[PDB]
Every structure is written in C-alpha cells, then in structure tokens.
Design an enzyme around this catalytic site. Structure first.
Site, PDB file in Angstrom:
ATOM      1  N   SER A   1       3.712 -10.576  11.520  1.00 43.54           N
ATOM      2  CA  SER A   1       3.430 -11.800  12.273  1.00 43.54           C
ATOM      3  C   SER A   1       4.647 -12.710  12.471  1.00 43.54           C
ATOM      4  CB  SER A   1       2.320 -12.590  11.575  1.00 43.54           C
ATOM      5  OG  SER A   1       2.750 -13.043  10.301  1.00 43.54           O
TER       6      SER A   1
ATOM      7  N   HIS B   1       8.758  -5.649  -0.408  1.00 43.28           N
ATOM      8  CA  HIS B   1       7.900  -6.573  -1.158  1.00 43.28           C
ATOM      9  C   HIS B   1       7.161  -5.888  -2.311  1.00 43.28           C
ATOM     10  CE1 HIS B   1       7.594  -9.376   2.620  1.00 43.28           C
ATOM     11  NE2 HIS B   1       8.755  -9.481   2.001  1.00 43.28           N
TER      12      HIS B   1
ATOM     13  N   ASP C   1       0.842  -1.195   0.000  1.00 43.47           N
ATOM     14  CA  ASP C   1       0.000   0.000   0.000  1.00 43.47           C
ATOM     15  C   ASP C   1       0.877   1.245   0.000  1.00 43.47           C
ATOM     16  OD1 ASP C   1       0.476   1.062   2.785  1.00 43.47           O
ATOM     17  OD2 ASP C   1      -0.562  -0.768   3.408  1.00 43.47           O
TER      18      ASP C   1
HETATM   19  C1  LIG Z   1       4.177 -10.845  -0.251  1.00 43.75           C
HETATM   20  C2  LIG Z   1       3.333 -10.270  -1.328  1.00 43.75           C
HETATM   21  C3  LIG Z   1       2.460  -9.287  -1.101  1.00 43.75           C
HETATM   22  C4  LIG Z   1       1.601  -8.731  -2.210  1.00 43.75           C
HETATM   23  O1  LIG Z   1       4.142 -10.370   1.135  1.00 43.75           O
HETATM   24  C5  LIG Z   1       2.942 -10.469   1.909  1.00 43.75           C
HETATM   25  C6  LIG Z   1       3.249  -9.733   3.191  1.00 43.75           C
HETATM   26  O2  LIG Z   1       3.952  -8.513   2.934  1.00 43.75           O
HETATM   27  C7  LIG Z   1       4.137 -10.763   3.867  1.00 43.75           C
HETATM   28  C8  LIG Z   1       4.347 -10.508   5.353  1.00 43.75           C
HETATM   29  O3  LIG Z   1       3.086 -10.549   6.007  1.00 43.75           O
HETATM   30  P1  LIG Z   1       2.773  -9.513   7.191  1.00 43.75           P
HETATM   31  O4  LIG Z   1       2.939  -8.105   6.680  1.00 43.75           O
HETATM   32  O5  LIG Z   1       3.668  -9.792   8.375  1.00 43.75           O
HETATM   33  O6  LIG Z   1       1.228  -9.702   7.584  1.00 43.75           O
HETATM   34  P2  LIG Z   1       0.583 -10.988   8.301  1.00 43.75           P
HETATM   35  O7  LIG Z   1       1.471 -12.207   8.167  1.00 43.75           O
HETATM   36  O8  LIG Z   1      -0.775 -11.177   7.681  1.00 43.75           O
HETATM   37  O9  LIG Z   1       0.413 -10.635   9.847  1.00 43.75           O
HETATM   38  C9  LIG Z   1      -0.361  -9.487  10.179  1.00 43.75           C
HETATM   39  C10 LIG Z   1       0.025  -9.065  11.580  1.00 43.75           C
HETATM   40  O10 LIG Z   1      -0.654  -7.848  11.887  1.00 43.75           O
HETATM   41  C11 LIG Z   1      -1.281  -7.981  13.155  1.00 43.75           C
HETATM   42  N1  LIG Z   1      -2.453  -7.086  13.212  1.00 43.75           N
HETATM   43  C12 LIG Z   1      -3.692  -7.282  12.715  1.00 43.75           C
HETATM   44  N2  LIG Z   1      -4.480  -6.200  12.966  1.00 43.75           N
HETATM   45  C13 LIG Z   1      -3.725  -5.293  13.621  1.00 43.75           C
HETATM   46  C14 LIG Z   1      -3.912  -3.940  14.186  1.00 43.75           C
HETATM   47  N3  LIG Z   1      -5.106  -3.302  14.103  1.00 43.75           N
HETATM   48  N4  LIG Z   1      -2.848  -3.361  14.787  1.00 43.75           N
HETATM   49  C15 LIG Z   1      -1.652  -3.969  14.888  1.00 43.75           C
HETATM   50  N5  LIG Z   1      -1.409  -5.193  14.398  1.00 43.75           N
HETATM   51  C16 LIG Z   1      -2.391  -5.884  13.771  1.00 43.75           C
HETATM   52  C17 LIG Z   1      -1.629  -9.448  13.270  1.00 43.75           C
HETATM   53  O11 LIG Z   1      -1.737  -9.801  14.650  1.00 43.75           O
HETATM   54  C18 LIG Z   1      -0.423 -10.091  12.606  1.00 43.75           C
HETATM   55  O12 LIG Z   1       0.646 -10.223  13.544  1.00 43.75           O
HETATM   56  O13 LIG Z   1       3.476 -12.010   3.618  1.00 43.75           O
HETATM   57  C19 LIG Z   1       2.686 -11.881   2.426  1.00 43.75           C
HETATM   58  O14 LIG Z   1       3.043 -12.883   1.466  1.00 43.75           O
END
Ligand SMILES: *C(/C=C/C)O[C@@H]1[C@H](O)[C@@H](COP(=O)(O)OP(=O)(O)OC[C@H]2O[C@@H](n3cnc4c(N)ncnc43)[C@H](O)[C@@H]2O)O[C@@H]1O
EC number: 2.3.1.286
Lengths: 9, 224
Positions: free
Chosen positions: B166, B108, B93
């Site tokens: 994550s 990425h 984004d």
């Molecule tokens: C490859 C291709 C993309 C087009 O990359 C994507 C992505 O960039 C990569 C890494 O994933 P990541 O960015 O770490 O996201 P998730 O694995 O889905 O984990 C999300 C993470 O965010 C936390 N979270 C959710 N909601 C919130 C809020 N409101 N505030 C803080 N944190 C939040 C979750 O608990 C998770 O820990 O992988 C893909 O292939």
C-alpha cells in the site's frame, strides 16, 4: 533506509 | 536478460485467505498496531502478544490456506531468470516458499521463526510459544532485515515490481524511488493505487491472482 515506520506519526 | 527485483506485501496473500490491514482503522485482526506490532507492546503485555502471533502462526498452517496464482507466477518468473531475479517480501507468511520461490528475503521476518532475544539467532518454529522467546518479526521502530542485499539489488535492477503493497510503511515504500534513481523501469501491481503509485512508470490494478500472472506472462513472452 531507517527503521520500519508508518507514514503517520 | 533484465535484472528483476520484486517487492511483495500483504495484498498478494489476501486471496490465499490471509486477511489484510483494514486501512480504515489502525487495526490488525481487531488489534491496535501499537499493542501487537511494537517492541513496547511486547514489553507491556508479552503473553497477549505471544498469543496474538501464536494465533497468526496457526492460521498460517491451516489446510484452506494455499498459494494462489500470483504466488505461482513469481515462482515461474524465478525459474526463467535465475540469479537475475530477487524476491523481497514484507510478508511473514511462507506462501512464496510453498509456491516454489527460493532465497526469498523476508525484510519484516517470518511467522514460522522465533528469536532468542539475547541471541540474535532466529530459530525454526511451527507451534505455539509458551513460557524469553519472541516472534522473528520486525516491529515498528526496529530495523528491517536484509537491507544491504536489498539496496544492492535496487541499484542493479532493470525492472522493479511492487505487488500487493500500500505504500504506507517505510523503508519498503521508498524502494520504488531508489529503483528509479538507478534507472530501473518501475511497475506497480495492486488491487488499488498505492500511496506511492504516482512514482511508478507502469501500473495495473485488479486482484493479484489475475493481474500478476498476466504481467508475468507478458514479461516472459517479451524475453523470447
Ligand atoms: C510489520 C510486521 C508484520 C508482522 O509489517 C507489516 C507489513 O509487512 C507492513 C507493510 O504492509 P503491506 O504489506 O504493504 O500491506 P498493507 O499496508 O495492509 O496493504 C495491503 C495492500 O494490498 C492490496 N490488496 C488487498 N487485496 C488484494 C488482492 N486480492 N490483490 C492485490 N492486492 C490486494 C491493498 O489494496 C493494499 O494496497 O506493514 C505492517 O506493519
């Protein structure tokens, strides 16, 4: 480093 | 002033209306990662994958999608630190940019860019992709972008902060370890403990919109 990779294979 | 390196992931944009990977499956927007997030998926069904990212690119530019308090706080942090600050994001984004951050490293790639694949050149692109161009997005099995500058910053950082990520996807998930090896203080800010949360020296959990401005504010006040 290495390529983009997920924790499970 | 301390050298600060910030890594962000999808969690910092969740509250901005950009939905995250549901950890329960292996699905992104009801799609399997293998089908829309690998070079092989693209070769197998280019028009589905192009349609998928066309959709993501449009949703990104909807009016109800805006930077939240967490994005803004990182812009304030850069304002205060200058060239001693570096922001690396896994997000495609542009919310960091809309918040006011500059020189954002998109390791990425970016949804608002496409790539002429015979070219190595990325091109600005805000609309649909029709009929071969591909999204300027790093898929699984492909090399992340800007790694040289990132690893240099990791070795130099006084503070490394990981936000909204994550800890499933490498090499980004390994940044905390690298930072610690070169002596950095490490901080995890997340909705919930990540897969690598135990590596961090300091940690705070809650929604990014609350946790990040809180941490940034106490960092900035500790300066003066
Ligand atoms: C490859 C291709 C993309 C087009 O990359 C994507 C992505 O960039 C990569 C890494 O994933 P990541 O960015 O770490 O996201 P998730 O694995 O889905 O984990 C999300 C993470 O965010 C936390 N979270 C959710 N909601 C919130 C809020 N409101 N505030 C803080 N944190 C939040 C979750 O608990 C998770 O820990 O992988 C893909 O292939």
């Amino acid at each position: 480093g290495g390529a983009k990779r997920h924790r499970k294979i | 002033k301390p050298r600060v390196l910030v890594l962000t992931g999808a969690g910092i944009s969740a509250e901005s209306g950009i939905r995250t990977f549901r950890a329960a499956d292996g699905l992104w927007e009801e799609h399997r990662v293998e089908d829309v997030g690998t070079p092989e998926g693209f070769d197998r069904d280019p028009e589905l994958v192009q349609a998928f990212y066309n959709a993501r690119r449009r949703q990104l530019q909807q009016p109800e999608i805006q930077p939240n308090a967490a994005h803004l706080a990182l812009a304030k942090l850069q304002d205060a630190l200058g060239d001693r600050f570096l922001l690396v994001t896994q997000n495609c984004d542009n919310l960091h940019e809309r918040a006011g951050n500059t020189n954002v490293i998109h390791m990425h790639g970016e949804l608002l860019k496409v790539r002429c694949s015979q070219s190595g050149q990325a091109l600005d692109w805000t609309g649909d992709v029709t009929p071969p161009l591909r999204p300027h997005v790093v898929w699984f099995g492909e090399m992340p972008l800007g790694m040289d500058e990132i690893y240099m910053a990791l070795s130099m950082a006084d503070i490394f902060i990981a936000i909204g990520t994550s800890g499933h996807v490498y090499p980004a998930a390994g940044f905390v370890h690298e930072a610690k090896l070169h002596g950095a203080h490490t901080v995890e800010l997340n909705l919930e403990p990540s897969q690598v949360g135990n590596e961090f020296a300091e940690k705070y959990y809650g929604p990014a919109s609350q946790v990040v401005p809180e941490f940034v504010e106490k960092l900035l006040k500790g300066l003066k």
